[PDB]
Amino acid sequence: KFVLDDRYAVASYGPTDALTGQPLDGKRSHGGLRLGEMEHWVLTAQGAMQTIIEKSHDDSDGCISYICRNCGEPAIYNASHPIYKCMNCDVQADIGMVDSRRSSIVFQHEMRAANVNITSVLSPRVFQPA
Amino acid sequence: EEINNRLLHGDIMPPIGLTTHDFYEKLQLNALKFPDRILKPIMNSINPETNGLFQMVATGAKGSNPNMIHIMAGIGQIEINTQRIQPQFSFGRTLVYYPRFALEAQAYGFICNSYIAGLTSPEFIFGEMNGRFDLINKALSTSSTGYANRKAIFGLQSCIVDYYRRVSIDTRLVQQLYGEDGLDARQLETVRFETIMLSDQELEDKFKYTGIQSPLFEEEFSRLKKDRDKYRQIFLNVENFNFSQLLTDVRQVPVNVASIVKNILLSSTSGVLPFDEKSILQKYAMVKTFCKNLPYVFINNIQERLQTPIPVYLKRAAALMRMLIRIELATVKTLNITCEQMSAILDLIRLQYTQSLINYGEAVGILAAQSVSEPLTQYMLDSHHRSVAGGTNKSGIVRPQEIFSAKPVEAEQSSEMLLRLKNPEVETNKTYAQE
Amino acid sequence: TIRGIPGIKNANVVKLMRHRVDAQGKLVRLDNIYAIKTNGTNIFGAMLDDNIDPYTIVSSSIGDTMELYGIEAARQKIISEIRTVMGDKGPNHRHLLMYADLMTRTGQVTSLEKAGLNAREPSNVLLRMALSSPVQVLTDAAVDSAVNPIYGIAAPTLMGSVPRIGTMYSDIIMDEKYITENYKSVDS
Amino acid sequence: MAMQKLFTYIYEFIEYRKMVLLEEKVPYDKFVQMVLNTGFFRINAETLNHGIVSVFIFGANGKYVHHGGDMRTLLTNTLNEKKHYEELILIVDKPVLSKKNILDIIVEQRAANPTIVINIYPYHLFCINIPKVSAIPKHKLITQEEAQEFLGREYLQPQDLMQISASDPPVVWLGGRPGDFVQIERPSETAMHAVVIRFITKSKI
Amino acid sequence: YMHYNKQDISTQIRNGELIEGVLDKKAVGAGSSGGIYHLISRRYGPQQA
Amino acid sequence: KDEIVESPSICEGFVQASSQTLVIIPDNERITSNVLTTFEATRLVAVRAQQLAINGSTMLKKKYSSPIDIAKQELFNRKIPLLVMRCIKVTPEGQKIVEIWNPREMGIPLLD
Amino acid sequence: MEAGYAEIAAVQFNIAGDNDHKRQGVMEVTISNLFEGTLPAEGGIYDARMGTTDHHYKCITCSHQRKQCMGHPGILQMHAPVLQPLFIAEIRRWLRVICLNCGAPIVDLKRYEHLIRPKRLIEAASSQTEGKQCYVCKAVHPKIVKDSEDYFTFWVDQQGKIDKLYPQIIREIFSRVTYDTVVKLGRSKNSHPEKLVLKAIQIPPISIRPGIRLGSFHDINNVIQYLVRKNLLIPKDLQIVRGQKIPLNIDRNLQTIQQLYYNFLLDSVSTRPAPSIMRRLPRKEGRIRKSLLGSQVWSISRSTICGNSDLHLDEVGYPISFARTLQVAETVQHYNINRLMPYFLNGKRQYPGCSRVYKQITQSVHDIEGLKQDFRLEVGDILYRDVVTGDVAFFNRQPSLERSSIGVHRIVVLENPKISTFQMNVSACAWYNADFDGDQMNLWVPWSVMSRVEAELLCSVR
Amino acid sequence: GGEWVVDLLENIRFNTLHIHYHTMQQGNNEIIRGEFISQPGGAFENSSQIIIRYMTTGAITIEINSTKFSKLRIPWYLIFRMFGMTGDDSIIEQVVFDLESNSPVNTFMIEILEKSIHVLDPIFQPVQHEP
Amino acid sequence: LIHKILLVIMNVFPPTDRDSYRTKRVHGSGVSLAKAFKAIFNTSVIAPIINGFKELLK
Amino acid sequence: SPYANCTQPARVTYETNQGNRFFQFYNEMPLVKTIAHNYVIPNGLNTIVAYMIYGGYNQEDSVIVSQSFIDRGGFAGTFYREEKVEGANYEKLVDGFVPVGTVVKKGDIIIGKDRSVMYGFDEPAVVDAVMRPHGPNDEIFGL
Amino acid sequence: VNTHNTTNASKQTERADMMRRVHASYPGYICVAQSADTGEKVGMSKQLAITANVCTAGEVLSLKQRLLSDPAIQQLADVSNKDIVRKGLARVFINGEWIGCCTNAFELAQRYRMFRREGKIVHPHTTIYWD
Ligand SMILES: [Mg+2]
Ligand SMILES: [Zn+2]
Ligand SMILES: [Zn+2]
Ligand SMILES: [Zn+2]
């Protein structure tokens, strides 16, 4: 066992998985290292949520998913090329940008494939009494 | 050899509930235990001043007395599950090196040599069995503990402390107050309560103040006695529904009032103070007001200023610290303390109490899961070595699984009951208890 | 049953340490108390027996304690049994309290298995799906049209969001009144 | 013997409920003889609200606890009586609770008389002074006004509190009904005292 | 079987001055509840400990 | 005339949650602690540091070369321009009952 | 237009009928030709309207690259209806509760009202029903038998005469049920049994099946293509009537299609190279436990740990090379410019230095080595500088069994090029239960301001 | 393009009876099991495993375990009758080796064999009593 | 064989020990390679038998 | 291991329980040799070990090493890794297979089939042999 | 020596690691010293002792013929189960095949052990076991 073989350091950019969008596994693949669910439990216990955002969203898969408030289904939004469309509502579409992970997006798409409709209830808007 | 000679003549008569083989094995195991006198020669051959191994063992840096006795003066009997080496090789045989139904102790795992002296082949083999058993038990316990830890984490993770310092899952209350005192595990110190074990006359002599004839000090002593009685009643009742729990005067509290008082006294330039009725009465009034307002630590300072009603459970939570403050800031115990020093002491006490509270977003469920899961590995090892107990199958994760899986009474193993005799007069007679 | 209390295989005599308040008010630890330790649990039979004091019967069975005494006695028994299992180097008492409170919040002793999770959090489809049987839990939720609020750790995590606890428990809003009196607009 | 303890402690249970007996107490031998001959023993008590509560002690072996017809007849005849009934307490042996037919009879009688409370309990509940058991903390019933004040202060709904079954032995001795709040004074080691409030739910069986 | 120096058998530190005794696992050991580092943390904070 | 059933799309039966109204508890009726928890202090400092990285305007008279130090000294000197909102309840009627706390008037925990 | 910030407050699960598939889908699969040239064949299963897997072609629907498109569902119109693989059991229960000739239920709906809603239908189905006569119609309910050979075929036995219940007959039977019957049985209006038979299925988004190879061999794509082909084989608008006989080839093709759908959804799932959609979720290697709970992360290092008596209990020794690899992002401002200028000037030649500069006006990341002479550090730019002494880093050892397993240590950069281990004080090991016998550790330096603040203020080992 | 080593592998002895208490089974009628992997000649010839099970119902069953007869729990006396045995007395003799002997082992074994003879296997029931 | 099993039921004899090496063997590469060759060569003999059998008919 | 009977080998590993060719130039016969060394080639050195506390740098199973002992060739050798199977990259000296004896840095392409094989390992390497044999199907093979 | 055969089956993790004990039959054939955390395997692998070897297939047919010709061996047809049980005859097995019976097991075993020691009639690598 040699230290030079065991050591590994990786920067922000590298190969990513095609399906989940996460870094490829291990040093052999030139990808990132794993923060299993035990590390997540420890970070949760310490209350370190900005660290969890930094590691599991920015460094790992992280994406702005657009959901229509009116129907709670994933919608189509593109700013550069103007696209503001919802397949279900058509007009009356109300797109909101939630922060999510490509892994969760793939999970929801898999669940929908099995004929299980997923509706996301966006948090209500809150206004001052004024 | 004497036990074996008894066996040949058939003198061994096992007691009720034990077979002849079991009684013989127990007698042999007891007979082969090393005495404490084994340490006499060891301590005679080593100079404690200039012995590195002994200095490391005694100072607690590394090692233990059994390690020294094994390295020098003999390993002794090898025990697996509190049992000698069972005849696995063949019917009546333990190894190929010993005859069938061998009677000598060496044939069942008794090592007369030390590691320094050198172990023969059978002794080495028996040691190998024991070491491999330790390793296998450690691995099994690690795996089982990890499994139970994952299950417990997913069963408890939803519990989070809210803005009322309660514990709830999706607004459904799990605890009215976290820990029943609302404190962080890392902000506690063990402190002894002086009045718990004191007699009535001793309590009066040590805590009643007689310098001033005002009934306020009578009220203070009455409060001290009432709190002592409450503590005694509660913890005697606690010890009455547990197998072996015993009343203890030491409790974990967020603030060590005695240390604060000592530190202020140490830095006090005035030293011994003259007698001043006004100062004594003012100090007593300040202490009483602080004790009354203590529960407002959980509630705002605004509510303390407004003197709004306090919920009962918050008063119960503050009761223990109220008792400690009463004991440690009694008039007799604070006589060389000025009013300003008392105010500073109270301010420091309140600051420490506020700093010892639990935060408003703590995932206490995960903390509890980790804390309860960590000692389970060592518990598994100890329980495996707890097979000596007869009639109860507590070995392994059987009992933790029974507790956590909520198994019915029928599925439970190692069930036990502790029954007390009818009256406290006949409970001191052993013959009646046996009857 | 010819004689004895059913379910009690053995009964031995043991010595107990117990505190008591004497006439002078001193708390003395009596060491010469004799009690009976049994090899089986039967609280009802022990209560019926006259020789045994019925108000101090201690059983290691959580189920029997819950049946005879109630949910609070069951919680105390859970605490005691977990403490006994922990050993000498046990955790702080508040963790045992958390275990017992969570396992008995619904009025009945619920396990830490998936059945207990279903009993305690039926609507948290995502959490139960994370623990075990994702397909069966998903099918049941779809059939029952379950609505899962996003709370805890597992539910936000499976949706890609971060749990709202710790540093994110409390919202932070900008102090408009303070800024409008102290800071100047970039355009201004 | 269960019958001895039941006879000793059923009147203690009646007293703990702040009730007044409507008939003179009989001796134990006669109590056993009535249980054997008739298959049940009846105790009538009056609450402070002047409601009548009847306690039926059923023998282990008897027609009422074996065939549903006799139990149905007994309950129907009892409820038809002109006495203003607040609750009916039927004390049976443990396996009798596991017999379906009897339970269906009880449920049907409850449905037929929504305004009457009919409860069936095992022997072990009334074979000891439950409130005096060391392992059982001190329970108390809190009025709806105090519960409402506590909930309003805590910003809670009744469904958010910890639940306690209405047939819990301490609650049974207290007499709390579903929809009531019970304050429990727990002894704790982290802090000497503690107070919790629990919401009473439906009784098992 | 051993001769113990009367000063070593008891450890006493008063106001930060080691009046008597020896320091070992009991006082400075890791995991030693009530050790000098526990008291330092309690009185002055974990960083000072 | 027997009628067959064609299942409508789920979206049609979905109604979005109605907008809520923010109910701010009066200052004198607040019951949550007046001392910032470690989580709240950390969150305040982090948010202020990020906003300093975005916009460098700061009230502090002393000069620092890092946003973290500026935010820390702003919290300690009671110049932080942020507020703490503690959501107490979300009533079914459509109210969000919250408590607004001013960090500059609150106690600060031990962050070091 | 802009999409305002939002958060998910609840999730609602429901059975997705064919109407949902038709409404949500963005196209319809009609051809089995996978690829036309390099670009995906239009109308196939790799149509670009359903997402992009490769960089060269972008999503037609939302005009995004492989990243930033979530996948865009498609439709496939089945020539014959197919039962829902995940709800077959449910279908059985319904067939055991409702009359097969009309919509009226054969069981008494008032015998189950007392039961809580979820268990009403299960209890009612559990009750024996064979031979019971419908009240509204003279038809007698036959026995419903589940074929043992497969997990989806159903038979109806009436007075000893057995018939195969094809999906169309089941759909017709369920369509006759009334919403009142559905509600009274504990199910909601969205769980109407009629939607348990699908005439159009959903072709999943390309993003979840990025196994397309531009133009092994085992993938969900092969199953989808085979299903499309076999569906094309079926006669269009095939009508099946109760008791009607079917050509053997048509029956075989229908069974093949149903089995293909069942294997596409629920193959090798508890009731080896067998791809299925629902076998992705379960197990420690599944989606939930490997991708959602836990993740792979960039900007992280791992190395062996050794001892160092000259490091404080809250300090960690970091190799210089790892300091040059991992970076910290500093947003240039009027107070950072003087301090950050040496980092910018050093570049990748000296230490401390920098690796990248994110220019805000260009919105682009430029490597320092290739930076032009005219380039300047300006307010709003982000400089990625090397890790220097005094920085904070998260140090972790696995398994993480206690909250102290992850700590925050001040970085002390060891400038000796021959040292490559993470050096820590021995007294610190008690936090992680570690020894210098070859034990390895992970270390990652926070780069964002929020994460750095949180690490310094909350997760410090003190 | 690599070096590989086929390590020695430990296996169970052949032509020997292995009797295991099948307590690991959950809710299984089988209480004991006997495996006999028979193999003729050398180690490369075909081998057949016969499994003898004793159940809580009291029936001794034999499974040949080959592709043919796989997963078939054939009662033992059926096997005996097929190969030529005619009388039940001789069948019991083949197991006990003596019917006249009155040793307690012989009597207990004969009782077990009666219980196995009379019990009716759900499969092979029609053939059970066929002479 | 049955007799022996019955003796274990009576508790006269204990069940066979799995760990004991008296009833164990150590097969080298020969046995494993022979099994793999058996499977593969059986497949490669099934493949032409059908091919040849079909060809001869045609 | 010598004097194995004087040690308890399991307890040695009880702490350690659970959890490309190197050629070493120098090896020596142990001063305390066992029978096992009549049949295997010893691999190691008779290092002078001092059992002492020296600055607390050898704690928790750590060991303090002599820099001169390392420099003199103790435990020094050659690690061999074969690319037999076979962004911005050098491409200048590839010459198909690179010349032997050329330092290969991170990023530089070891072989050029644009098609080339990049060097990923951080540690620099030196080319030993670029000889190319013939593949099983006669295809170009790189060793 | 690898025991991966068990690993293929879904054996309990606790049970599998339980098999890594040192058995009383290992001495002289399997090294009793631990793996020393080699890291090649968790420890499921075991090493042969220094003098341990593995025997190859013998000539079973020659020994079988010799035993059949031996006067002490009585062929199965000649003996009767009643004779076996009553007269106290001893069963004789070769490679698990019951070839015949013997009057005195110990005498036959000792005689063939002597023959093995001579090394002419019986090959030295043939196991002779007398129960
Ligand atoms: Mg280590
Ligand atoms: Zn929409
Ligand atoms: Zn797209
Ligand atoms: Zn009908």
Numbering used by the authors:
A (entry chain B): 1113 to 1242
B (entry chain A): 678 to 1112
C (entry chain A): 1258 to 1445
D (entry chain E): 1 to 205
E (entry chain A): 581 to 629
F (entry chain F): 36 to 147
G (entry chain A): 1 to 215, 222 to 277, 294 to 484
H (entry chain B): 197 to 327
What does the published report state?
African Swine Fever Virus is a Nucleo-Cytoplasmic Large DNA Virus that causes an incurable haemorrhagic fever in pigs with a high impact on global food security. ASFV replicates in the cytoplasm of the infected cell and encodes its own transcription machinery that is independent of cellular factors, however, not much is known about how this system works at a molecular level. The ASFV RNAP bears a striking resemblance to RNAPII with bona fide homologues of nine of its twelve subunits. Key differences include the fusion of the ASFV assembly platform subunits RPB3 and RPB11, and an unusual C-terminal domain of the stalk subunit vRPB7 that is related to the eukaryotic mRNA cap 2´-O-methyltransferase 1.
We have solved the cryo-EM structures of the RNAP with the clamp in closed and open conformations at 2.7 and 2.9 Å resolution, respectively. We solved the structure of the ASFV core RNAP in two conformations, i. e. an open and closed state, which refer to the mobile RNAP clamp and the width of the DNA-binding channel. Subsequently, the batches of corresponding particles were isolated and provided two maps at the nominal resolution of 2.73 Å for the closed conformation, and 2.92 Å for the open conformation. However, to achieve better structural information for the protrusion and wall domains, we employed a new refinement method, named 3DFlex refinement, applied after 3D refinement of the closed conformation map. The bridge helix (BH) is in the straight conformation, while the trigger loop (TL) is structurally well-defined in both closed and the open ASFV RNAP structures. We identified two additional densities of unknown nature in both maps of the closed and the open RNAP. The first density is located inside the DNA-binding channel, forming a stacking interaction with the side chain of residue Y824 on the bridge helix (BH) and surrounded by several positively charged residues. The second density is located at the foot domain of vRPB1, and also surrounded by positively charged residues.
